[PDB]
Amino acid sequence: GVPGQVDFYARFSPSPLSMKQFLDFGSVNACEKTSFMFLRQELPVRLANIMKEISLLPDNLLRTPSVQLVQSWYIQSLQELLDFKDKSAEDAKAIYDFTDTVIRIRNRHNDVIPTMAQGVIEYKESFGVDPVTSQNVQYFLDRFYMSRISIRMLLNQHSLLFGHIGSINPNCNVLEVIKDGYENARRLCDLYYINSPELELEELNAKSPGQPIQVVYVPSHLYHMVFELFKNAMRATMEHHANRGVYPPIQVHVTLGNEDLTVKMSDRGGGVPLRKIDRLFNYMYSTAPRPRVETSRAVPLAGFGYGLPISRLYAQYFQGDLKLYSLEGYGTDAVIYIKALSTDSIERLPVYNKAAWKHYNTNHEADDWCVP
Template identity: 70%
Template sequence: ASLFVSICISILKLPLSENYILDLFIGSTNGCERTSFAFLRQELPVRFANILKEIDLLPDKLLSTPSVKLVRSWYIQSLKELIEFHQKSPDDQKVLSDFIDTLIRVRNRHHDVVPTMAQGVIEYKDTFKVDPVTNQNIQYFLDRFYMSRISTRMLMNQHTLLFDDKSGSGHPRHIGSIDPCCDVVEVVNDAYESAKMLCDQYYLTSPELKLTQVNGKAPGEPINIVYVPSHLFHMLFELFKNSMRATVEFQENSSTLSPVEVTVVLGKEDLAIKISDRGGGVPVRKIERLFSYMYSTAPRPNVDDSRNTPLAGFGYGLPISRLYAKYFQGDLNLYSICGYGTDAIIYLKALSTESIEKLPVFNKSASKHYQATSEADDWCVPSKDPKNMAKQSAAS
């Protein structure tokens, strides 16, 4: 097994476009399943082995935490189970059936990877002093680790949704988890309604939605793209929650709440979704912290509760949402005016041929990131947090 893992690490991962993923799963049912099996039995072990190698480059003190040990054991076990299919025949129906069962087992095993790894980071921070270099290395790793997880779940979901007779039929228009004609405005409205329900439950009020859509490719036509609706919903739901909470809290003394304004624009190359609120904004110095796994100030939940409240309390909503956007070569950016409000913009590729997976590659360059040491800054850099000048003058 260890020899095979070494071979897997030496094989470059194949980043797939949405078009390729669709083509991989379209065709005569059995032939298509065999093609998918032949591809995944090689590609999944490569992706698992590569990220497992990066886990092993983490600081020893982080690796020694119970939660990270548990996550590592899941990856080792899953890799072993996937390797077993390397030499098996795709023409054997039992092999194909067993492969589906294995994918479901692996997917279920990794269900709580995000909160468990987050718990490991908390255990590390609680026990050891964390320096800026370690923060940077962990941020680098977690972005790659969670992106790798998004990619492997995407491939496993595609295969099981299409070829597992026991899973039931999904949305008739979808090919696995991909919607070839994803109605962007419909997903925006769904995400808004879900966030509004939470906001109403907690605050007993919520801001209205003001929606503008511009189809620059086909004026007057609905805005549709090839995309994964669940990924888009995840991003929008997170942004709506943040905007609604900020608006309600910033305008708590107002008789009416400013609406959350959403602008959806489809251009020749990009789809952009801008969510604007009047929630008071955040200081510029805090923007990057919102995307940091190490700076969360949210309350710490019990990992056992994670199935009911995914990611709740770990402060991972924004960084994970940005990874979903980047997965198919998009992005998610925040632009804030302190004292006024915030614009969040999701950028996605308008063309499915350009929507290609963004995958971490383990090589010498990646390895160097984990060996970074603290160096003196060659710019004069002020403190990250503003000083209290009143206290300073009193002390002098």
């Protein structure tokens, strides 16, 4: 029945699109029939591939009310999409009903990321950290959230085009997005610490010096990354210098190279030893019950969610990256790497196959080197 439908579409691989393909589609032609033909196969494929991995979760995580709800959302969206498998692209009502279904699914899935995060909280609350499964949880959540980002991208594009090119800005003003992230992080910082660091912004357009720095990008993806990084930099700065009462600025250097757009953000917030860096990207370590609604107390800036690992997934989604390197006792740099060329910006998508299944059913240990 439903397992048969999931198995049929999970056999296929997701088909990654480049940023240029996204852009070229909705610019001139903007054919709703073309989007239909692509999505009536691609959305089921992407839903079914990730649904096979939901089923491999540790039972105590799978059985949580929040994961069960997310899975039921995916099952329902998949079934609604499969009703168009045999309908005709020339059937105008079918096209109309499909665009309507895309919008319905988009709203149904609006809360997937925090609901999944709620399931990890429920799991951690009632069973604790399990070192065997916890490697599988980290593997799953990277892939589930990257998958969700890609599905969200497809739904948003179709919804905006048929309900700036979709959510893509062909001329994203990088420094304006950065200032926007700074000001919103600073507002939260003032509310919590009653003070905040200044911003020092430097830019270099090596490609065309003195010219504004723009790229083809999804602005909300860039906003999410820099906003989350600013909150982490500010938290570290405010807590490390609380005794002094003088707070060093946060420095940002933006560079457009022949190939890389890089955003480097630097703080003097006291740093982190190298041994402790990676837990900042670990979902289980970052999982804590969420701030309560019934209080006027300010919300903490960082350490209370998945802002950082999800930021890195945004960077990696279009073949970029997000790296942290810290000098313990001094401060920390974060570097966002983005492809400067739209033709290099290709979706990075997980695929369910024997290799993926093997990851859930194997111990991963470096037995060819001596134990440290």
